Design a protein around this ligand. Structure first.
Ligand code: HEM
Ligand code: HEM
Ligand SMILES: CCCOc1ccc(-c2ccc3c(C)cc(N)nc3c2)cc1CN
Ligand SMILES: CCCOc1ccc(-c2ccc3c(C)cc(N)nc3c2)cc1CN
Ligand SMILES: C[C@H](O)[C@H](O)[C@H]1CNc2nc(N)[nH]c(=O)c2N1
Ligand SMILES: C[C@H](O)[C@H](O)[C@H]1CNc2nc(N)[nH]c(=O)c2N1
Ligand SMILES: [Cl-]
Ligand SMILES: [Cl-]
Ligand SMILES: [Gd]
Ligand SMILES: [Gd]
Ligand SMILES: [Zn+2]
Lengths: 404, 402
């Protein structure tokens, strides 16, 4: 049972929940690999034991372990896979699984919200236009005129033999990335690959550096079909600074809804390769990562010239001063537009109280230090001084190969 | 079957074949990762010694020679007669450098080859220990043009007690308990301050009182030694455009000299081997002055800046912190005391990683310690994956001798 200490206060807890960790990660007693983004790389008898475990913990969570429909439900899944080779999840189970996969996401700092999550069942789906209308319901409900609401929608589970639903965009909302005559990029260099595929499936390109991409949606077996998104459904925030009058003239924008559409949900031994989820942004994800990373929009040097900073010596900390203003402008702009957003101080303080909750509930909580600590002002937030344990519980979201 | 390591800012790919030779185990398993934890006989003394000797004779491109096999046969028969062996002077210098080279949480390692090793293995007493330390401080400080140095006191040996420096650093500030239960001075140093007092020291009452040295000779109580003030170079902190900053009274010292770690070379253990370099500015500005459990000046700075401290979304903490760091960098540059900022430091470490891949095929690095505590993703180390493992020779934590 790992002893975990908080170095700001001195408190000590023990992770007894780690002792129930399954899917072995990447580390060994000889070498630690916690800093790798993708750990490693990417006869149905094992379906039973994964469904048995998941159903067992479903009934513990609602008191009904021992007697009643608990043992009963064990038999239906036994007979359903003995007949068909897969099984269908009940509605409450799909909702309980979805929430647990969020609760178990080691790198998510927003997990204090894990209990409030709207789960749209789309297992009826069987068409590309069908999912496109499913996706537009999610976005509409999730955006909610800017008072954002956590949502996931679950499309039909992978079946042995015959194909899979797959959203080809990594997010539902993503900006174009076109290569110049220079080979350099106008737009988001993160999305130069998917922009390449959008065009070669009949998309006509656009203006420049803030073009919303179309959704490449893939019904089983048949190829991907492009789907344009209505501008009305894509809520965006133009970026302005509360006191730097020129920042708005830089013409920077970002969208409201972070909605990840390329991860695979796994509940009770069933894989849902199309299950896009969405929450709201932490300000540093936009300001520091999306806009300041050297391989993203790389705006930091441009904002520093406008602030008339000394970009000729790193010891002037001009990068640090420029970044903070970019984060200030993001927070101000989203707030001015009444769009839900959270600063990294508020967000990490909530994660600490999530840790304390999860200590009482389950005796621990899987957490990935490097992704919990903000990308600016790390040691100024409480999680910096908090030791953490990372391990992999099910249900979970996993990374998955891309369909090409 | 070696770890694939990716740099995300650029797209580089390399593999860490040096990890496979890792000669110790750490706290991680396939079941769970503990990377974020701060604190993670003859035949085995002989097998460590052989790996070191092999390392040394490799570095002087003399592997597998007669001079090589001689020294192997030599140390083996010395362990037989006495249970231990002695390093030659060149072997000691190489081992101290390798320990620095192998230190996984050190961002200043691009320098590892430039190290001044002082051989104090003939030291006989605490008084003499004091003299060797004062000279270390004088040479490393060098009137503000700092030099990397290490002093190596006698090794652990059967029959006698260890030399120990009780102080965690050669220069530290007193931490005095209050009547509010509060702490005047540095709260990290409240215990060593109590220790010093009960061993005879007359305490002050400032917030930047330099502590005496508690020095332990074999089988003796610790003895108290005052550092002559003119040996301890200090830098008063001011801000270049915030003139009220000087009225805080804040200071920090030139020389970071860590004195409580253990140096291991070829199975030998040196429990007293203080080493020193020069500060990276975030250690002073961010950690030592802004940690809530350290001097904790952040809120008082931000109020003086007229920042809005009612709400976190004004980012008052980030703004005050960046200006506390600007003051540190400016104050040291004004006082002509060596200092590196986290941007230059992390850029040099990137060069170290590339040097190390070509040289040894990888490099042990602790990402959570290499990435600076402010402006992380603005530096190039944030976007570099790293492999953490324990190589020997090495520095190691050891328990407090009290
Ligand atoms: C409600 C507000 C939320 C916030 C502020 C938030 C924030 C974050 C942040 C900051 C990361 C780090 C990733 C990065 O920065 O690169 C992350 C990762 C992640 N989030 Fe959350 N998130 C929220 C809601 C959700 C929801 C609703 C889900 C799913 C139902 C979710 C699941 C995940 C997963 C699966 C990952 C990464 C996979 C892994 O860590 O292994 N989050 N989130
Ligand atoms: C000359 C410039 C140097 C710089 C800028 C530097 C910087 C650093 C920093 C910032 C840390 C992490 C401290 C923290 O934030 O808690 C560190 C750790 C460390 N450094 Fe360096 N250092 C320098 C020289 C040296 C020298 C000369 C030695 C030894 C001869 C050394 C050995 C170590 C060790 C042992 C650690 C702890 C590593 C671990 O526990 O894995 N450093 N250094
Ligand atoms: C690049 C390999 C994987 O990276 C990842 C992996 C995951 C997420 C991610 C996923 C969901 C989020 C939600 C719901 C809200 C939010 N506020 N943020 C999120 C961030 C970002 C990245 C970007 N690095
Ligand atoms: C308490 C767990 C271990 O912490 C540690 C561990 C090590 C060092 C350390 C050691 C040597 C340094 C040198 C030579 C120069 C410099 N510029 N910095 C240093 C920092 C600081 C801390 C502070 N936390
Ligand atoms: C190399 C390093 O592990 C990698 O760049 C990680 C570090 N921490 C991160 N943390 C968050 N939140 N998002 C990221 O993309 C990363 N990247
Ligand atoms: C809990 C946490 O891992 C711990 O406080 C570490 C994090 N990384 C660090 N990194 C450096 N360089 N110095 C530190 O003191 C710490 N503290
Ligand atoms: Cl994003
Ligand atoms: Cl220090
Ligand atoms: Gd101007
Ligand atoms: Gd001024
Ligand atoms: Zn690990």
């Amino acid at each position: 049972f790992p002893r975990v200490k908080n170095w700001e206060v001195g408190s000590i807890t023990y992770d007894t929940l780690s002792a129930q960790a399954q899917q072995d990660g990447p580390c060994t007693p000889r070498r630690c690999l916690g800093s790798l983004v993708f750990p490693r790389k990417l006869a149905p008898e094992q379906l039973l034991s994964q469904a048995r475990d998941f159903i067992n913990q479903y009934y513990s969570s609602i008191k009904r372990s021992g007697s009643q429909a608990h043992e009963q439900r064990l038999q239906e899944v036994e007979a359903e896979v003995a007949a068909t080779g897969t099984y269908q999840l009940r509605e409450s189970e799909l909702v309980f699984g979805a929430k647990q996969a969020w609760r178990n996401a080691p790198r998510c700092v927003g997990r204090i919200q894990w209990g409030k999550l709207q789960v749209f069942d789309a297992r009826d789906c069987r068409s590309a236009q069908e999912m496109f209308t499913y996706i537009c319901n999610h976005i509409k409900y999730a955006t909610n005129r800017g008072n954002l609401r956590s949502a996931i929608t679950v499309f039909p589970q992978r079946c042995p033999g015959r194909g899979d639903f797959r959203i080809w965009n990594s997010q539902l909302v993503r900006y174009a990335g076109y290569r110049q005559q220079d080979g350099s990029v106008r737009g988001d260099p993160a999305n130069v690959e998917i922009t390449e595929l959008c065009i070669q499936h009949g998309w006509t390109p656009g203006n420049g550096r803030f073009d919303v991409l179309p959704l490449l949606l893939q019904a089983p077996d048949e190829p991907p079909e492009l789907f344009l998104l209505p501008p009305e459904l894509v809520l965006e925030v133009p970026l302005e600074h509360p006191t730097l009058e020129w920042f708005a003239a830089l013409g920077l924008r970002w969208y409201a809804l972070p909605a990840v559409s390329n991860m695979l949900l796994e509940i009770g031994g069933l894989e849902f390769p199309a299950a896009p989820f969405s929450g709201w942004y932490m300000s540093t994800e936009i300001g520091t990562r999306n806009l300041c990373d050297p391989h993203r929009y790389n705006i930091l040097e441009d904002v520093a010239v406008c602030m008339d900073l000394d970009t000729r010596t790193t010891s002037s900390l001009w990068k640090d001063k420029a970044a903070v203003e970019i984060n200030v402008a993001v927070l101000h702009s989203y707030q001015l537009a009444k769009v839900t957003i959270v600063d990294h101080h508020a967000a990490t303080a909530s994660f600490m109280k999530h840790l304390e909750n999860e200590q009482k509930a389950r005796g621990g909580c899987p957490a990935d230090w490097a992704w919990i600590v903000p990308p600016i002002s790390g040691s100024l937030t409480p999680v910096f001084h908090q030791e953490m344990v990372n391990y992999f519980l099910s249900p979970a979201f996993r990374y998955q190969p891309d369909p090409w």
